[PDB]
Design a protein around this motif. Sequence first.
Motif, PDB file in Angstrom:
ATOM      1  N   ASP A 496       0.893  -1.153   0.000  1.00  0.00           N
ATOM      2  CA  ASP A 496       0.000   0.000   0.000  1.00  0.00           C
ATOM      3  C   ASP A 496       0.930   1.200   0.000  1.00  0.00           C
ATOM      4  OD1 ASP A 496      -2.432   1.533   0.307  1.00  0.00           O
ATOM      5  OD2 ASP A 496      -1.908   1.804   2.421  1.00  0.00           O
ATOM      6  N   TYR A 497       1.495   1.488  -1.165  1.00  0.00           N
ATOM      7  CA  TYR A 497       2.431   2.592  -1.292  1.00  0.00           C
ATOM      8  C   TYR A 497       2.866   2.720  -2.741  1.00  0.00           C
ATOM      9  CZ  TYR A 497       6.531   5.488  -0.125  1.00  0.00           C
ATOM     10  OH  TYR A 497       7.495   6.472  -0.015  1.00  0.00           O
ATOM     11  N   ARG A 498       3.331   3.908  -3.111  1.00  0.00           N
ATOM     12  CA  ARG A 498       3.818   4.180  -4.458  1.00  0.00           C
ATOM     13  C   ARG A 498       5.069   5.017  -4.343  1.00  0.00           C
ATOM     14  NH1 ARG A 498       1.582   1.082  -5.964  1.00  0.00           N
ATOM     15  NH2 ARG A 498       0.487   0.472  -7.889  1.00  0.00           N
ATOM     16  N   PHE A 499       6.140   4.605  -5.015  1.00  0.00           N
ATOM     17  CA  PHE A 499       7.391   5.367  -4.970  1.00  0.00           C
ATOM     18  C   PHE A 499       7.294   6.406  -6.071  1.00  0.00           C
ATOM     19  CE2 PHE A 499       8.281   1.263  -3.130  1.00  0.00           C
ATOM     20  CZ  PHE A 499       9.081   1.562  -2.041  1.00  0.00           C
ATOM     21  N   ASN A 500       7.727   7.630  -5.799  1.00  0.00           N
ATOM     22  CA  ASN A 500       7.642   8.671  -6.817  1.00  0.00           C
ATOM     23  C   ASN A 500       8.769   8.517  -7.824  1.00  0.00           C
ATOM     24  OD1 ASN A 500       6.163  11.039  -7.721  1.00  0.00           O
ATOM     25  ND2 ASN A 500       8.019  12.211  -7.244  1.00  0.00           N
ATOM     26  N   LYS A 659      23.370  19.240  -5.668  1.00  0.00           N
ATOM     27  CA  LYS A 659      23.379  18.720  -4.305  1.00  0.00           C
ATOM     28  C   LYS A 659      21.987  19.010  -3.747  1.00  0.00           C
ATOM     29  CE  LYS A 659      26.976  20.679  -2.313  1.00  0.00           C
ATOM     30  NZ  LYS A 659      28.018  20.811  -1.251  1.00  0.00           N
ATOM     31  N   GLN A 660      21.418  18.064  -3.010  1.00  0.00           N
ATOM     32  CA  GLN A 660      20.072  18.260  -2.498  1.00  0.00           C
ATOM     33  C   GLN A 660      19.934  18.103  -0.999  1.00  0.00           C
ATOM     34  OE1 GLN A 660      18.377  19.105  -5.446  1.00  0.00           O
ATOM     35  NE2 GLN A 660      17.386  20.255  -3.787  1.00  0.00           N
ATOM     36  N   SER A 661      18.685  18.007  -0.560  1.00  0.00           N
ATOM     37  CA  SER A 661      18.371  17.836   0.840  1.00  0.00           C
ATOM     38  C   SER A 661      17.407  16.682   0.969  1.00  0.00           C
ATOM     39  CB  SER A 661      17.747  19.101   1.410  1.00  0.00           C
ATOM     40  OG  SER A 661      18.725  19.859   2.095  1.00  0.00           O
ATOM     41  N   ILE A 662      17.632  15.860   1.986  1.00  0.00           N
ATOM     42  CA  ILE A 662      16.798  14.698   2.239  1.00  0.00           C
ATOM     43  C   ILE A 662      15.518  15.151   2.917  1.00  0.00           C
ATOM     44  CG2 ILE A 662      16.709  12.448   3.342  1.00  0.00           C
ATOM     45  CD1 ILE A 662      19.816  12.419   3.166  1.00  0.00           C
ATOM     46  N   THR A 663      14.391  14.661   2.407  1.00  0.00           N
ATOM     47  CA  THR A 663      13.072  15.018   2.912  1.00  0.00           C
ATOM     48  C   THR A 663      12.490  13.891   3.733  1.00  0.00           C
ATOM     49  OG1 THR A 663      11.706  14.005   1.183  1.00  0.00           O
ATOM     50  CG2 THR A 663      12.725  16.119   0.672  1.00  0.00           C
ATOM     51  N   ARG A 664      11.394  14.160   4.430  1.00  0.00           N
ATOM     52  CA  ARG A 664      10.756  13.111   5.204  1.00  0.00           C
ATOM     53  C   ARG A 664      10.291  12.089   4.179  1.00  0.00           C
ATOM     54  NH1 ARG A 664      10.630  15.118   9.932  1.00  0.00           N
ATOM     55  NH2 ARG A 664      10.093  17.301  10.410  1.00  0.00           N
ATOM     56  N   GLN A 665      10.128  12.540   2.938  1.00  0.00           N
ATOM     57  CA  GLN A 665       9.687  11.647   1.878  1.00  0.00           C
ATOM     58  C   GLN A 665      10.780  10.652   1.542  1.00  0.00           C
ATOM     59  OE1 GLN A 665       7.786   9.988  -0.188  1.00  0.00           O
ATOM     60  NE2 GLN A 665       6.306  10.768   1.304  1.00  0.00           N
ATOM     61  N   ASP A 669      10.897   6.567   1.794  1.00  0.00           N
ATOM     62  CA  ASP A 669      11.245   5.664   0.701  1.00  0.00           C
ATOM     63  C   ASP A 669      12.239   4.614   1.161  1.00  0.00           C
ATOM     64  OD1 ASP A 669       9.573   6.850  -1.183  1.00  0.00           O
ATOM     65  OD2 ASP A 669      11.114   8.314  -1.790  1.00  0.00           O
ATOM     66  N   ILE A 670      13.286   5.038   1.866  1.00  0.00           N
ATOM     67  CA  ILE A 670      14.258   4.075   2.344  1.00  0.00           C
ATOM     68  C   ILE A 670      13.563   3.122   3.292  1.00  0.00           C
ATOM     69  CG2 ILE A 670      16.347   3.690   3.609  1.00  0.00           C
ATOM     70  CD1 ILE A 670      16.659   5.041   0.898  1.00  0.00           C
ATOM     71  N   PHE A 671      12.725   3.684   4.160  1.00  0.00           N
ATOM     72  CA  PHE A 671      11.979   2.902   5.132  1.00  0.00           C
ATOM     73  C   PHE A 671      11.243   1.735   4.508  1.00  0.00           C
ATOM     74  CE2 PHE A 671       8.151   1.762   7.476  1.00  0.00           C
ATOM     75  CZ  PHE A 671       8.734   1.391   8.697  1.00  0.00           C
ATOM     76  N   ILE A 672      10.351   2.026   3.564  1.00  0.00           N
ATOM     77  CA  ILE A 672       9.580   0.970   2.913  1.00  0.00           C
ATOM     78  C   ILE A 672      10.506   0.025   2.153  1.00  0.00           C
ATOM     79  CG2 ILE A 672       7.606   0.433   1.468  1.00  0.00           C
ATOM     80  CD1 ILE A 672       6.906   2.135   3.802  1.00  0.00           C
ATOM     81  N   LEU A 673      11.458   0.595   1.421  1.00  0.00           N
ATOM     82  CA  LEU A 673      12.411  -0.216   0.671  1.00  0.00           C
ATOM     83  C   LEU A 673      13.133  -1.166   1.614  1.00  0.00           C
ATOM     84  CD1 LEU A 673      13.990   2.293  -1.866  1.00  0.00           C
ATOM     85  CD2 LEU A 673      12.516   0.317  -2.358  1.00  0.00           C
TER      86      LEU A 673
END
Length: 716
Positions: A496-500, A659-665, A669-673
Amino acid sequence: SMKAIVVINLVKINKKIIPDKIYVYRLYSIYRLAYENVGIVIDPENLIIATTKELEYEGEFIPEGEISFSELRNDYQSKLVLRLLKENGIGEYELSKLLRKFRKPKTFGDYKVIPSVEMSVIKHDEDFYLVIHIIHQIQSMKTLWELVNKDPKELEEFLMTHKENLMLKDIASPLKTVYKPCFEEYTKKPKLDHNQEIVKYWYNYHIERYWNTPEAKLEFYRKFGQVDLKQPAILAKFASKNYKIYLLPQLVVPTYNAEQLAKEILEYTKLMPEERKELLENILAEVDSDIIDKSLSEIEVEKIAQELENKIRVRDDKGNSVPISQLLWTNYSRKYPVILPYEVPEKFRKIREIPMFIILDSGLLADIQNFATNEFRELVKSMYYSLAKKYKEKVITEDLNSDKGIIEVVEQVSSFMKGKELGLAFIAARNKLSSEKFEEIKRRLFNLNVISQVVNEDTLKNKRDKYDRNRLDLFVRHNLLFQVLSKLGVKYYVLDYRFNYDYIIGIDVAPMKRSEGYIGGSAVMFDSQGYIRKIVPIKIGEQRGESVDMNEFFKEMVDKFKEFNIKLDNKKILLLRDGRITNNEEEGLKYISEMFDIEVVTMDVIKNHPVRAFANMKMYFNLGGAIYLIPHKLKQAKGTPIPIKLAKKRIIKNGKVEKQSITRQDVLDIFILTRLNYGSIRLPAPVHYAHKFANAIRNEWKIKEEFLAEGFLYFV
């Protein structure tokens, strides 16, 4: 879920430690130089150092000129602060000795477990913190030669099995230098020489070079004895940090990093969060300096809602969908649970039959063998009408602990498998078997197109159902089924999830030469729906430099996928690997970014770091600019959870890096993965499996592209 405050293994450092004047220079290496000069290294290649004392080194150097601390990038400030903590007596040597005052070395069999701490500095919001992380080394008490009963064969037998983690400490050297045995590239064959001239020279080298006195020599022969000319010399390179040294088994003891890797030992190296908390506090209270805080720091973490832990479900033949997390009249039946897959490889549609082998370890007690055969029979039944709920048995008993039995097993199976496409083996083995024997039994059965599932004596004796000792725990049964189905490419679950993203890709870099091959690594692919769809090998040419043409590596990834029915062209992917994305890997990804117009999202996924949160719960927090995530708890096993460190995220479009910033999103993603473990009794699924595969290739596993084409985790 709210937030919470947890204690971590960091203790704040006093700014009064920050150096007054720093001197820069340009060019017992460059590192020892700076070190002895109480300084660090600004630029690697350019040979640029930064000292806090007037550089004493009559050599090829150019005094660039003084610099102010605020000028060094964070890393260097922290590295410089670290070097300075050492000068105040706060270093690994000292704190490790303090640690051992409360956590003493314990001996198990011929081995000793040595506790020590690993220290590093982390700059967090204008402040510097010292991370003190408790670790263990397992060092053999007997020399390698003694350990293998001075038998040349048994010796080569040792370097081979323990090849992946073995290190050798020269206990005959006053420096106790640690080395890594050399192996003939692309082989389990360790570099050796029986040339007694080599043995004599180097044995002699030690006495002449370090024990030149009569008493010292007495001690040496008392400790090591004469030169056993019957021992081969082992070719090796330093483990620290192109150049090879000779080692004599008679003078080296095998060592291991506990954390990098035996019931007994394991029960000593695993420490509860409170035990680590306490030991650190004991060390601190023994530290005589106000240059660092007396207590461990606390930080605010974000708890991970228990809901995000139920986004993966399985269903039965009825309409019962349940999240992978765990009276009725039928509860007396040994029938395994029923699982109604969401997808079944199209390969199983044509396939005629599927031979089922029950391989029983003759060393197991008769009643244990009987029990296992019954468990597996039930497993096969659910296995069936699971593979076709949408639309023979050969029992082999042999000594799985002797090389002769494994051979007879493979032969007996080979016999029944001739003419068949797919076969299945359910193996009951005693816990004695080494990984090696397990890996060989499994790989040798696969060459015969037989996927296998091992259940050890332990599981068979301590995981029985509370209401039926002649049946396995419902929890274990479900997990056995999930393992087999995953090994067969079956999409038995739903997320029950979709990766962007279009695809999430995990890659592994590991050179290997295979009969008609020469492979540089692996890559595993998951679709946005969270399913594994492609597992490809990444062939490359004979590499030029001492590095790997990542441009070639990544280009072949796309091509190899295009061949596997997936085109990454003009797509957005999340590409991950085990560790920090290196420069070469970045460039390689930029290259493949323009050449195929690919939007590449990547970041560092670090499992080997020392930061520890003394709490056993799912969470994540920002420290030093990186994110630390504990994807799951621990319910049976003793120990402290190991966070996955997330950092240096970037987005790559048309060969351009932002260079970017890590989001709660991203964290989600890592979590579900990471939650995708396929019922295994730490890393994001994609990365984890790329590694298992890169490992299969280096162990000679057959490469069925028919199976990998649909995600068969047959090597996992």
